[PDB]
């Protein structure tokens, strides 16, 4: 993760990990509205 200070950068890196653990990454598959079913 990036940050203005080392503590801020480390804190941001913690969020980058949690996003990739809960499968909420920015490039995750888009939500599916296609189904008529």
């Amino acid at each position: 993760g990036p940050g203005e200070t080392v503590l801020v950068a480390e804190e941001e890196a913690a969020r980058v990990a949690l996003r990739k653990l809960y499968g909420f990454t920015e490039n995750r598959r888009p939500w599916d509205y296609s189904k008529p079913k």
């Binding site: 990036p2 920015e26 490039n27 509205y33």
Partner: protein, 148 residues
């Protein structure tokens, strides 16, 4: 006139088409004079075309108000709250029908300069460029001239 006017970004009212498409026009009002030359074309629109337009667009409520009137006027109201008013004074039937269709197709978003022809909330999939992308790392993270 670009710097003398406002501008905005490309947008949709409520993510109009993501799940289902909703028509933004919700109400049309037509004011007529029963006997007035200028309202003739609007009168013919009511006789011939208003009923078909209403059936094609069942989500728009159409109000037709014949009353003593100097100029016929069309008022269009949208779901976002925008209101547009059009003078129909002495227009042919076709022009009024053509104009009425334009109101149905439009959204209430202001017609002003749009900065970009494209809007996306996910511009990147592989990561936005930053100065360290395409820079190789160094052993022990030693910056240049650092002795260690």
């Amino acid at each position: 006139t670009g710097r003398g006017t406002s501008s905005r970004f490309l947008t949709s009212v409520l993510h109009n088409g993501l799940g289902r498409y909703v028509q933004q026009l919700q109400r049309l009002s037509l004011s007529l004079s029963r006997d007035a030359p200028s309202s003739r074309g609007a009168r013919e629109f009511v006789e011939r075309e208003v009923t078909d337009f209403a059936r094609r667009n069942p989500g728009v409520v159409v109000y037709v108000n014949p009353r003593p009137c100097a100029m016929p006027r069309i008022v269009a109201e949208y779901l976002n709250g925008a209101v547009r008013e059009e003078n129909v004074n002495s227009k042919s039937v076709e022009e009024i029908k053509s104009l009425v269709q334009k109101l149905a197709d439009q959204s209430g978003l202001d017609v002003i300069r749009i900065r970009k022809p494209f809007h996306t909330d996910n511009p990147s999939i592989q990561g936005q460029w930053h100065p360290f992308t395409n820079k190789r790392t160094a052993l022990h993270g030693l910056r240049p001239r650092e002795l260690r």
